[PDB]
């Protein structure tokens, strides 16, 4: 499998600089481009530019020149972007592209292979861990919920009952108030089931090395 | 640089049914014999997939129900039959000319028949309480299509301050969405008032869906 | 006199062609007259070099003193037709015992090609019997158990694709066409290409075996409705001047044709006219070392079968600008047979112990860890029996008939090809 | 049949006023060690005893003359066969092999060459006995570099070129509707021809190779096999052409037997019906295996040939050697000669042999009663070449027909391996450039019993 591992989520303050990296692994490193694109929130997709990794030589879209630089590391087949100081304007998600197979030229190459993506925020704000309060409610279905609250930067992950509930779950998109992050969750599940068997929201913040089990305690 | 619009913005397709989107492009993004038109696929929260590349080939892995086609100027991406899991945005790219460029974006639904919205509210939790804050958080499950009403009234009158709402993203299997709408009181605010309404207004019902409780029980 | 023999003490053959002749049906087993055909002045002057090494190192008090190098040496402008000169290094005394377990030579220079190289070679194997190439780049023969006293002093075409690839990476081009020899040499190129870049963007758009009736014409037809702008042309002499003469005549015109070290160097193709027509050309190209005293043996040497040159009126001027290619491997494959020579009579720094049985078994031995310095390089070759000497560089033929150094190619570095683009002027 | 009686003990070497050279792969490896006894090799190297003792005991064929040959082994190795080949070069009165410029009144020790069998092998001497102008004619050599007459001047076949062989195999894989397939050769001659013409040719009928491997014939092929094989997978092709020489087509299995690896398997002929492949442990869970090989007759007196001569053989047992051991060959070792992979080749090697002496007849003037021959005739083999050239001679029931490359008017026979028995089975044929195949015909080693996809 041909596999682009991107480094993870990064919060950086404005006016510094910040590294994202590239690892590209089953197939020969230097002999495809490594295209480097921008999505801001609002889901536009940019070209920032790529890189030749066998000889180093890079293009770039005019807005990122002198904001982007693209560079290799050929020995341990890692490509990298760095950004230069930074805005809020620069909070988004980044991906590393690699060109496919058949273009005529490097330009016409068209993109085959992903990377995760990188999310990007750009702020002053400080690192809070999440709180996680309980969502105790009768029908043949009761629903049940978990309150995320307060917490910075993205992003946290919910599951439920350690991944075995996983029918009946809606996580909702944080919201984010003053600099922090508000998420919550439901899960749906028979009635003659709760409360004798135990549902339990779990909940980690690994930016501020958070994890929280909270059992869902009736009232 | 050339630029690509999409039409339309947003498509409802009922599954079983055929998907038309289209792109045009400012100048012709044709050479060597080919159209460098590409169309990506991207499900909310994943990188982008590529379904058809010069404006025609299918790239493997890719069902056949995906197809694409046009030159120069004017390009279709096709979807036939739409299946559940096929809702996401869909993006044409051209890569004739430095530097590459992405349409807006075309944001493509499952069309279903209408659902009424399932409505859970709840009161602070007791932990919450005792931080000096106090959220009253209502779900409203698993409804169609997405437009949707959500008031607040304590003691008889609505609320306005302090209420965040959150939509999910369609769901894979039944096509519906989910919402979560939170009002976040002071601990001294809830304490100081009674009963907690949440009020969901959608087209399947000309009666306002409505959840309560009163805080002293 | 004759240019192709000089006694000695010890003989080394050497195997050269310095005719041309297309292959044709014969009914007769016998050696053909290459004297009559298309005179090779670039192959005369590396046959030249050959005479000037085993003179020089006979000048010398230090290197074999007092034991003399001779040679037999043969223009072989047929593969298929070289067996009678073969046996004659090979004989004990005009005869070959087939079943035999003291060879007239000690070893052997050559040839220059791989298909020679390919036909001949397993009765040198046989005994051991060393053969040191200057030119054959066949990937074949790193295989050490199919051909165990085969050594050269040329690179393989592994090597040089590498090269031809890193110039195809450092630009922008990715659609290629690969034009090849319809033979050993060429068959041997497109495997080795294909190969390296299967896992790569450059993709193989357009590839044909070139012979003598290729029909240039529609090569050349499927090339542009393709849109292919690169190139490569991995062939002989003979083959590539076909290709590129036909361009001029087809206007085939804005490609960029990439050359191999057979040919980078062309003397004739730069300068003729209408080449500036079919666009820009680039190649791998062998660094021209220069040999000392090389030019003044020119100057004094103008003044059985395989053995006549038929070439007087040789304008003295016209061979010493000849291409130079190969020049330091036929420099050094003889100097690796001298010192092999010299080490297995173990000579000291003025003396050799005298009359000693020499058998070629003995001189592959002291050829495989050969180590010496020579023009202030370093003669060595691995297990494989090829060299570790040796550049390549990145020419362009610029607009007075030149071959600008533009570039290096680095076996083993980080960025394994570098370029000065600016140096290249695009037509 | 009277004639049996007659015949001598020798193996690999009869006098005679003529004689042939033999160029047999008897003895191979595990300044060399040639250890291993290959069965098929001494078999076909008997084959050419027989065809030598029939046509000496026919009165009508060369009556004035006596029929005689020298057999070598190969080894299948660069360094041995070269020695053999410079032998039937000497003159014919001294044993030694003179340098001269011009062989043209140059009476060789053999007139004409028998053999080899692989295609590694004729590029060893092909280009040597190609100068002298020795008519060589393979027995099982089927490159097609070798139909080139102006690169290998004096090449001829009783077995078809495999440019032929892999257009077969292409319409097999037309008519299923398969389209995506991988191919695998041994890394030598044989299979990297068969790899590339295969390619090539299935560019022309639209199927597209998902995958190239080849197996190395000197040194461990485990890692590149599993290298393979794990393309194999990776690309989920379910068809797979294995052009390749016996040896690493048993490593080859071995290992697809131990990964458990299932599908349809596309046999070249030269392990199309090697024991050596089929009687590996659970080699008939691999799936279905379909075969090429070479349309022949089958030689009905080869063995009861063979029972008398190694009746006689073991006779004459109390009294170097191409196979030293086969000294005490017993009527116990006839099934030598019955093995179905001898048994269905023996004919491209009595073909050869009687190529040769059809043509002999023709060269020395015969008739029925006598020859233009006597002691003082001199015999050169470009004479010989004359008129093999575009040479037409029935044989037994067989018109062989040579074209202008030395190539036979030769088909292929398409077969499968049946597990059950252990048999193989007909199911089609190769003739022109016409398959025909009975689709009715195969069995289709699957979960439900039917063809994949
Ligand atoms: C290579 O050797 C062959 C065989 O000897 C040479 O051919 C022989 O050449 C002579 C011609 O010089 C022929 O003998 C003479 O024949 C002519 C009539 O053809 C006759 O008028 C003369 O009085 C004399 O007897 C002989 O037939 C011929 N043998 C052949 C052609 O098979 C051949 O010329 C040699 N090639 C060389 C030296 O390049
Ligand atoms: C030298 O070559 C020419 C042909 O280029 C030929 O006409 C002439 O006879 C030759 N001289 C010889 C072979 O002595
Ligand atoms: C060798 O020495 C002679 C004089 O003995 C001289 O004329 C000749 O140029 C020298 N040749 C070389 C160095 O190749
Ligand atoms: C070189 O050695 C030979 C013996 O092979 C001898 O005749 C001669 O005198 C020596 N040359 C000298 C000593 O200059
Ligand atoms: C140049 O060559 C092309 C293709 O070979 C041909 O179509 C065209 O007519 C030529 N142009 C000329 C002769 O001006
Ligand atoms: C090669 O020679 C040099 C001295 O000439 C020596 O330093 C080096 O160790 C040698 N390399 C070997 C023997 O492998
Ligand atoms: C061409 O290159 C040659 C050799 O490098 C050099 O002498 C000459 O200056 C160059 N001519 C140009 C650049 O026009
Ligand atoms: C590259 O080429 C130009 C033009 O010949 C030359 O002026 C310059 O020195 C070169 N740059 C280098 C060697 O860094
Ligand atoms: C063959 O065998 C018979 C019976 O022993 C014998 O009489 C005869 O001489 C032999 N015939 C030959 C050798 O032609
Ligand atoms: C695969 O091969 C292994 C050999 O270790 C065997 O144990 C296993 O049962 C096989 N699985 C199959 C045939 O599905
Ligand atoms: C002949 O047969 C015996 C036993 O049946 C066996 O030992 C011997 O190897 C055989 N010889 C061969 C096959 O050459
Ligand atoms: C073979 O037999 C056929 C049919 O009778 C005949 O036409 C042909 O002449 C024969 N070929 C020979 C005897 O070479
Ligand atoms: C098995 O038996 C015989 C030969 O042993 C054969 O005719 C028959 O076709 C075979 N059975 C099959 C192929 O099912
Ligand atoms: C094909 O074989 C089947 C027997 O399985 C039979 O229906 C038919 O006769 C055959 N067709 C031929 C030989 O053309
Ligand atoms: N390298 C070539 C010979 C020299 C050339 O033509 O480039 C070969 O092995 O045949
Ligand atoms: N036909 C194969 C030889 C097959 C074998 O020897 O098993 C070849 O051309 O080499
Ligand atoms: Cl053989
Ligand atoms: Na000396």
Same mark, same amino acid.
């Given at each position: 499998?041909?596999?682009?591992?991107?480094?993870?989520?990064?919060?950086?303050?404005?006016?510094?600089?910040?590294?994202?990296?590239?690892?590209?692994?089953?197939?020969?490193?230097?002999?495809?481009?490594?295209?480097?694109?921008?999505?801001?929130?609002?889901?536009?997709?940019?070209?920032?530019?790529?890189?030749?990794?066998?000889?180093?030589?890079?293009?770039?879209?005019?807005?990122?020149?002198?904001?982007?630089?693209?560079?290799?590391?050929?020995?341990?087949?890692?490509?990298?972007?760095?950004?230069?100081?930074?805005?809020?304007?620069?909070?988004?998600?980044?991906?590393?592209?690699?060109?496919?197979?058949?273009?005529?030229?490097?330009?016409?190459?068209?993109?085959?292979?992903?990377?995760?993506?990188?999310?990007?925020?750009?702020?002053?704000?400080?690192?809070?861990?999440?709180?996680?309060?309980?969502?105790?409610?009768?029908?043949?279905?009761?629903?049940?919920?978990?309150?995320?609250?307060?917490?910075?930067?993205?992003?946290?992950?919910?599951?439920?009952?350690?991944?075995?509930?996983?029918?009946?779950?809606?996580?909702?998109?944080?919201?984010?108030?003053?600099?922090?992050?508000?998420?919550?969750?439901?899960?749906?599940?028979?009635?003659?089931?709760?409360? !004798?068997?135990?549902?339990?929201?779990?909940?980690?913040?690994?930016?501020?090395?958070?994890?929280?089990?909270?059992?869902?305690?009736?009232? | 640089?050339?630029?690509?619009?999409?039409?339309?913005?947003?498509?409802?397709?009922?599954?079983?049914?055929?998907?038309?989107?289209?792109?045009?492009?400012?100048?012709?993004?044709?050479?060597?014999?080919?159209?460098?038109?590409?169309?990506?696929?991207?499900?909310?929260?994943?990188?982008?997939?590529?379904?058809?590349?010069?404006?025609?080939?299918?790239?493997?892995?890719?069902?056949?129900?995906?197809?694409?086609?046009?030159?120069?100027?004017?390009?279709?991406?096709?979807?036939? #039959?739409?299946?559940?899991?096929?809702?996401?945005?869909?993006?044409?790219?051209?890569?004739?000319?430095?530097?590459?460029?992405?349409?807006?974006?075309?944001? /493509?639904?499952?069309?279903?028949?209408?659902?009424?919205?399932?409505?859970?509210?709840?009161?602070?939790?007791?932990?919450?309480?005792? !931080?000096?804050?106090?959220?009253?958080?209502?779900?409203?499950?698993?409804?169609?299509?997405?437009?949707?009403?959500?008031?607040?009234?304590?003691?008889?009158?609505?609320?306005?301050?302090?209420?965040?709402?959150?939509?999910?993203?369609?769901?894979?299997?039944?096509?519906?969405?989910?919402?979560?709408?939170?009002?976040?009181?002071?601990?001294?605010?809830?304490?100081?008032?009674?009963?907690?309404?949440?009020?969901?207004?959608?087209?399947?019902?000309?009666?306002?869906?409505?959840?309560?409780?009163?805080?002293?029980? | 006199?004759?240019?192709?023999?000089?006694?000695?003490?010890?003989?080394?053959?050497?195997?050269?062609?310095?005719?041309?002749?297309?292959?044709?049906?014969?009914?007769?087993?016998?050696?053909?007259?290459?004297?009559?055909?298309?005179?090779?002045?670039?192959?005369?002057?590396?046959?030249?070099?050959?005479?000037?090494?085993?003179?020089?190192?006979?000048?010398?008090?230090?290197?074999?003193?007092?034991?003399?190098?001779?040679?037999?040496?043969?223009?072989?402008?047929?593969?298929?037709?070289?067996?009678?000169?073969?046996?004659?290094?090979?004989?004990?005394?005009?005869?070959?015992?087939?079943?035999?377990?003291?060879?007239?030579? %000690?070893?052997?220079?050559?040839?220059?090609?791989?298909?020679?190289?390919?036909?001949?070679?397993?009765?040198?194997?046989?005994?051991?019997?060393?053969?040191?190439?200057?030119?054959?780049?066949?990937?074949?023969?790193?295989?050490?158990?199919?051909?165990?006293?085969?050594?050269?002093?040329?690179?393989?075409?592994?090597?040089?694709?590498?090269? %031809?690839?890193? %110039?195809?990476?450092?630009?922008?081009?990715?659609?290629?066409?690969?034009?090849?020899?319809?033979?050993?040499?060429?068959?041997?190129? /497109?495997?080795?290409?294909?190969?390296?870049?299967?896992?790569? =963007?450059?993709?193989?758009?357009?590839?044909?075996?070139?012979?003598?009736?290729?029909?240039?014409?529609?090569?050349?037809?499927?090339?542009?409705?393709?849109?292919?702008?690169?190139?490569?042309?991995?062939?002989?002499?003979?083959?590539?001047? +076909?290709?590129?003469?036909?361009?001029?005549?087809?206007?085939?015109?804005?490609?960029?044709?990439?050359?191999?070290?057979?040919?980078?160097?062309?003397?004739?193709? #730069?300068?003729?006219?209408?080449?500036?027509?079919?666009?820009?050309?680039?190649?791998?190209?062998?660094?021209?070392?220069?040999?000392?005293?090389?030019?003044?043996?020119?100057?004094?040497?103008?003044?059985?079968?395989?053995?006549?040159?038929?070439?007087?009126?040789?304008?003295?001027?016209?061979?010493?600008?000849?291409?130079?290619?190969?020049?330091?491997?036929?420099?050094?494959?003889?100097?690796?047979?001298?010192?092999?020579?010299?080490?297995?009579?173990?000579?000291?720094?003025?003396?050799?112990?005298?009359?000693?049985?020499?058998?070629?078994?003995?001189?592959?031995? =002291?050829?495989?860890?050969?180590?010496?310095?020579?023009?202030?390089?370093?003669?060595?070759?691995?297990?494989?029996?090829?060299?570790?000497?040796?550049?390549?560089?990145?020419?362009?033929?610029?607009?007075?008939?030149? +071959?600008?150094?533009?570039?290096?190619?680095?076996?083993?570095?980080?960025?394994?090809?570098?370029?000065?683009?600016?140096?290249?002027?695009?037509? | 049949?009277?004639?049996?009686?007659?015949?001598?003990?020798?193996?690999?070497?009869?006098?005679?006023?003529?004689?042939?050279?033999?160029?047999?792969?008897?003895?191979?490896?595990?300044?060399?060690?040639?250890? !291993?006894?290959?069965?098929?090799?001494?078999?076909?190297?008997?084959?050419?005893?027989?065809?030598?003792?029939?046509?000496?005991?026919?009165?009508?064929?060369?009556?004035?003359?006596?029929?005689?040959?020298?057999?070598?082994?190969?080894?299948?190795?660069?360094?041995?066969?070269?020695?053999?080949?410079?032998?039937?070069?000497?003159?014919?009165?001294?044993?030694?092999?003179?340098?001269?410029?011009?062989?043209?009144?140059?009476?060789?020790?053999?007139?004409?060459?028998?053999?080899?069998?692989?295609?590694?092998?004729?590029?060893?001497?092909?280009?040597?006995?190609?100068?002298?102008?020795?008519?060589?004619?393979?027995?099982?050599?089927?490159?097609?570099?070798?139909?080139?007459?102006?690169?290998?001047?004096?090449?001829?076949?009783?077995?078809?070129?495999?440019?032929?062989?892999?257009?077969?195999?292409?319409?097999?894989?037309?008519?299923?509707?398969?389209?995506?397939?991988?191919?695998?050769?041994?890394?030598?001659?044989?299979?990297?021809?068969?790899?590339?013409?295969?390619?090539?040719?299935?560019?022309?009928?639209?199927?597209?190779?998902?995958?190239?491997?080849?197996?190395?014939?000197?040194?461990?092929?485990?890692?590149?096999?599993?290298?393979?094989?794990?393309?194999?997978?990776?690309?989920?092709?379910?068809?797979?052409?294995?052009?390749?020489?016996?040896?690493?087509?048993?490593?080859?299995?071995?290992?697809?037997?131990?990964?458990? /690896?299932?599908?349809?398997?596309?046999?070249?002929?030269?392990?199309?019906?090697?024991?050596?492949?089929?009687?590996?442990?659970?080699?008939?869970?691999?799936?279905?295996?379909?075969?090429?090989?070479?349309?022949?007759?089958?030689?009905?007196?080869?063995?009861?040939?063979?029972?008398?001569?190694?009746?006689?053989?073991?006779?004459?047992?109390?009294?170097?050697?191409?196979?030293?051991?086969?000294?005490?060959?017993?009527?116990?070792?006839?099934?030598?000669?019955? =093995?179905?992979?001898?048994?269905?080749?023996?004919?491209?090697?009595?073909?050869?042999?009687?190529?040769?002496?059809?043509?002999?007849?023709?060269?020395?003037?015969?008739?029925?009663?006598?020859?233009?021959?006597?002691?003082?005739?001199?015999?050169?083999?470009?004479? /010989?070449?004359?008129?093999?050239?575009?040479? !037409?001679?029935?044989?037994?029931?067989?018109?062989?027909?040579?074209?202008?490359?030395?190539?036979?008017?030769?088909?292929?026979?398409?077969?499968?391996?049946?597990?059950?028995?252990?048999?193989?089975?007909?199911?089609?044929?190769?003739?022109?450039?016409?398959?025909?195949?009975?689709?009715?015909?195969?069995?289709?080693?699957?979960?439900?019993?039917?063809?994949?996809?």
């Amino acid at each position: 499998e041909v596999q682009l591992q991107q480094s993870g989520p990064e919060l950086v303050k404005p006016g510094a600089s910040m590294k994202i990296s590239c690892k590209a692994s089953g197939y020969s490193f230097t002999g495809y481009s490594m295209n480097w694109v921008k999505q801001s929130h609002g889901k536009n997709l940019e070209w920032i530019g790529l890189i030749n990794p066998y000889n180093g030589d890079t293009t770039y879209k005019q807005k990122f020149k002198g904001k982007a630089t693209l560079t290799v590391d050929r020995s341990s087949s890692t490509a990298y972007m760095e950004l230069l100081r930074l805005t809020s304007e620069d909070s988004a998600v980044y991906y590393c592209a690699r060109s496919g197979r058949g273009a005529p030229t490097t330009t016409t190459a068209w993109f085959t292979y992903w990377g995760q993506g990188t999310l990007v925020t750009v702020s002053a704000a400080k690192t809070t861990p999440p709180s996680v309060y309980p969502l105790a409610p009768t029908n043949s279905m009761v629903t049940l919920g978990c309150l995320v609250k307060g917490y910075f930067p993205e992003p946290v992950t919910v599951t439920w009952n350690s991944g075995s509930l996983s029918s009946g779950v809606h996580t909702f998109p944080a919201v984010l108030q003053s600099d922090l992050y508000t998420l919550s969750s439901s899960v749906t599940v028979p009635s003659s089931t709760w409360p !004798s068997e135990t549902v339990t929201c779990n909940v980690a913040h690994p930016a501020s090395s958070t994890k929280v089990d909270k059992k869902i305690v009736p009232r | 640089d050339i630029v690509l619009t999409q039409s339309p913005a947003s498509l409802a397709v009922s599954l079983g049914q055929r998907a038309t989107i289209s792109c045009r492009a400012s100048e012709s993004v044709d050479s060597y014999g080919n159209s460098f038109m590409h169309w990506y696929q991207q499900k909310p929260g994943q990188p982008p997939i590529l379904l058809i590349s010069r404006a025609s080939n299918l790239e493997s892995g890719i069902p056949a129900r995906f197809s694409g086609s046009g030159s120069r100027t004017d390009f279709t991406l096709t979807i036939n #039959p739409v299946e559940a899991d096929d809702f996401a945005t869909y993006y044409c790219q051209q890569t004739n000319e430095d530097p590459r460029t992405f349409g807006g974006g075309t944001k /493509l639904e499952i069309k279903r028949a209408d659902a009424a919205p399932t409505v859970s509210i709840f009161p602070p939790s007791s932990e919450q309480l005792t !931080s000096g804050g106090a959220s009253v958080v209502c779900f409203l499950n698993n409804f169609y299509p997405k437009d949707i009403n959500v008031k607040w009234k304590i003691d008889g009158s609505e609320r306005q301050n302090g209420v965040l709402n959150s939509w999910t993203d369609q769901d894979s299997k039944d096509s519906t969405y989910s919402m979560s709408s939170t009002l976040t009181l002071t601990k001294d605010e809830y304490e100081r008032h009674n009963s907690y309404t949440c009020e969901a207004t959608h087209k399947t019902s000309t009666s306002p869906i409505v959840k309560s409780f009163n805080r002293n029980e | 006199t004759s240019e192709f023999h000089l006694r000695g003490d010890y003989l080394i053959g050497g195997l050269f062609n310095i005719h041309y002749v297309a292959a044709a049906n014969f009914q007769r087993p016998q050696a053909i007259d290459c004297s009559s055909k298309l005179f090779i002045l670039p192959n005369y002057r590396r046959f030249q070099m050959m005479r000037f090494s085993v003179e020089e190192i006979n000048n010398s008090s230090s290197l074999l003193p007092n034991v003399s190098l001779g040679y037999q040496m043969f223009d072989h402008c047929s593969d298929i037709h070289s067996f009678p000169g073969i046996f004659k290094l090979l004989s004990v005394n005009d005869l070959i015992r087939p079943w035999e377990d003291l060879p007239n030579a %000690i070893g052997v220079v050559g040839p220059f090609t791989s298909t020679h190289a390919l036909s001949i070679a397993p009765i040198f194997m046989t005994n051991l019997f060393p053969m040191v190439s200057y030119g054959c780049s066949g990937s074949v023969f790193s295989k050490e158990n199919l051909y165990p006293s085969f050594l050269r002093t040329v690179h393989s075409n592994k090597d040089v694709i590498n090269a %031809i690839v890193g %110039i195809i990476l450092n630009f922008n081009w990715r659609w290629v066409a690969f034009l090849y020899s319809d033979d050993d040499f060429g068959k041997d190129g /497109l495997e080795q290409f294909k190969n390296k870049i299967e896992d790569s =963007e450059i993709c193989l758009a357009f590839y044909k075996a070139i012979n003598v009736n290729t029909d240039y014409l529609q090569v050349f037809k499927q090339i542009e409705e393709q849109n292919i702008k690169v190139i490569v042309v991995f062939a002989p002499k003979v083959y590539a001047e +076909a290709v590129v003469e036909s361009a001029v005549q087809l206007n085939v015109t804005n490609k960029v044709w990439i050359a191999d070290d057979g040919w980078s160097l062309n003397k004739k193709l #730069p300068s003729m006219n209408g080449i500036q027509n079919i666009g820009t050309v680039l190649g791998v190209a062998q660094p021209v070392v220069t040999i000392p005293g090389f030019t003044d043996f020119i100057y004094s040497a103008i003044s059985f079968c395989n053995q006549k040159c038929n070439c007087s009126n040789l304008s003295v001027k016209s061979l010493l600008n000849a291409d130079p290619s190969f020049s330091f491997p036929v420099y050094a494959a003889v100097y690796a047979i001298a010192h092999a020579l010299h080490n297995t009579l173990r000579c000291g720094s003025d003396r050799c112990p005298k009359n000693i049985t020499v058998h070629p078994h003995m001189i592959l031995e =002291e050829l495989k860890k050969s180590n010496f310095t020579l023009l202030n390089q370093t003669v060595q070759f691995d297990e494989n029996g090829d060299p570790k000497f040796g550049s390549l560089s990145v020419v362009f033929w610029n607009s007075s008939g030149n +071959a600008e150094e533009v570039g290096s190619y680095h076996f083993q570095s980080s960025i394994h090809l570098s370029i000065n683009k600016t140096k290249i002027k695009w037509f | 049949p009277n004639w049996f009686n007659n015949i001598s003990t020798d193996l690999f070497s009869m006098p005679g006023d003529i004689k042939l050279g033999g160029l047999f792969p008897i003895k191979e490896q595990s300044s060399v060690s040639c250890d !291993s006894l290959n069965k098929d090799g001494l078999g076909r190297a008997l084959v050419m005893k027989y065809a030598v003792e029939e046509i000496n005991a026919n009165s009508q064929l060369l009556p004035g003359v006596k029929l005689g040959y020298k057999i070598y082994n190969t080894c299948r190795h660069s360094a041995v066969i070269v020695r053999p080949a410079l032998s039937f070069l000497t003159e014919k009165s001294n044993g030694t092999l003179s340098v001269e410029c011009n062989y043209t009144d140059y009476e060789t020790d053999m007139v004409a060459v028998i053999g080899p069998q692989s295609s590694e092998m004729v590029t060893v001497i092909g280009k040597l006995l190609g100068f002298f102008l020795m008519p060589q004619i393979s027995f099982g050599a089927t490159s097609d570099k070798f139909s080139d007459s102006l690169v290998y001047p004096s090449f001829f076949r009783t077995v078809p070129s495999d440019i032929r062989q892999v257009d077969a195999m292409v319409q097999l894989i037309k008519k299923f509707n398969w389209n995506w397939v991988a191919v695998v050769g041994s890394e030598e001659e044989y299979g990297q021809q068969g790899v590339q013409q295969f390619s090539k040719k299935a560019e022309d009928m639209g199927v597209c190779v998902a995958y190239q491997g080849l197996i190395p014939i000197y040194d461990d092929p485990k890692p590149a096999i599993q290298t393979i094989i794990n393309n194999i997978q990776t690309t989920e092709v379910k068809v797979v052409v294995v052009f390749s020489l016996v040896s690493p087509a048993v490593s080859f299995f071995e290992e697809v037997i131990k990964k458990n /690896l299932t599908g349809v398997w596309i046999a070249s002929s030269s392990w199309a019906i090697s024991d050596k492949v089929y009687s590996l442990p659970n080699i008939d869970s691999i799936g279905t295996v379909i075969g090429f090989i070479d349309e022949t007759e089958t030689l009905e007196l080869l063995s009861p040939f063979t029972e008398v001569l190694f009746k006689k053989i073991h006779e004459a047992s109390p009294t170097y050697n191409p196979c030293p051991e086969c000294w005490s060959l017993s009527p116990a070792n006839v099934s030598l000669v019955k =093995e179905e992979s001898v048994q269905r080749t023996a004919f491209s090697v009595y073909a050869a042999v009687y190529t040769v002496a059809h043509a002999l007849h023709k060269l020395l003037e015969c008739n029925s009663a006598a020859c233009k021959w006597s002691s003082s005739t001199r015999l050169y083999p470009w004479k /010989l070449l004359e008129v093999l050239k575009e040479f !037409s001679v029935n044989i037994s029931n067989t018109s062989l027909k040579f074209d202008q490359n030395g190539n036979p008017n030769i088909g292929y026979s398409v077969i499968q391996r049946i597990w059950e028995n252990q048999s193989l089975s007909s199911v089609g044929s190769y003739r022109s450039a016409n398959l025909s195949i009975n689709e009715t015909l195969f069995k289709w080693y699957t979960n439900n019993s039917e063809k994949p996809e």
